[PDB]
């Protein structure tokens with residue numbers, strides 16, 4: 576029922592990854608909500624359950640497959656399926672707990688992790704911060720295998736957490752930010768794995784705040800500036816939506832758009 580987007584790390588190229596991220600965005604946003612040229616994800620309020628999730632089927636060179644489930648309201652990876660088992664992060668509320676019962680309904684074994692799926696929790700379990708976890712095609716290839724083998728005992732909990740961190744950034748964060756997509760394209764082009772620099776980290780950390788600032792803006796102008804970081808870690812001040820158009824690809828719904836107010 577839910578749309579499926581396929582990607583493989585096997586012989587991945589800049590183009591195949593670009594096609595994948597574009598398709599993910601296409602299934603996440605409906606086209607109904609575009610503000611300052613930036614699409615907004617569907618509002619959770621009144622969103623029918625048959626429109627709530629998308630599925631990302633990840634394959635690798637090792638001939639293994641896992642399916643991630645993404646919530647369309649925030650691009651959040653809520654859980655995954657590998658063969659006869661499915662695993663969901665501890666839901667943040669009762670609504671999201673009910674919603675996930677509509678996922679992988681034919682699977683033999685259903686588990687809900689006792690831990691939530693946010694970076695802070697996953698970093699704790701991994702024993703490493705995002706800034707020390709390498710990203711790229713190699714890490715993703717390995718992440719798919721680690722997720723696949725979890726139910727049989729082959730994957731340590733820190734490895735599982737690290738593997739989620741890799742998947743979330745290379746799929747959800749890349750979907751959210753053209754900038755992060757670009758950073759992943761670079762890694763794929765040269766087949767060189769590397770941890771995300773401060774520009775990537777601060778964008779990830781600022782997605783919610785940027786979404787709200789843009790939506791609350793006065794004709795694009797922020798009431799309060801947002802501080803981002805450059806690749807070298809130096810501060811970059813954001814005063815306006817204009818500078819973000821090439822950077823942010825989609826936003827979480829935060830408030831209803833104000834009337835057009837033409838002159």
Ligand SMILES: Nc1nc2nc(C(=O)N[C@H](CO)Cc3ccccc3)cnc2c(=O)[nH]1
Nearest residue numbers: 650651652653692693694695743747779780
């Ligand atoms: N499973 C899963 N987890 C995710 N976790 C995060 C995440 O933890 N983001 C954090 C908290 O909102 C960003 C942040 C905000 C403010 C200060 C510091 C950091 C983001 N995206 C996902 C995601 O797509 N799938």
Ligand SMILES: Nc1nc2nc(C(=O)N[C@H](CO)Cc3ccccc3)cnc2c(=O)[nH]1
Nearest residue numbers: 646649651653664665666667671693782783
């Ligand atoms: N479906 C779903 N969504 C979740 N979202 C959050 C979360 O931290 N959301 C924040 C604040 O509302 C917004 C946000 C910020 C950055 C990236 C993604 C979402 C936490 N857990 C879940 C969860 O268990 N299932």
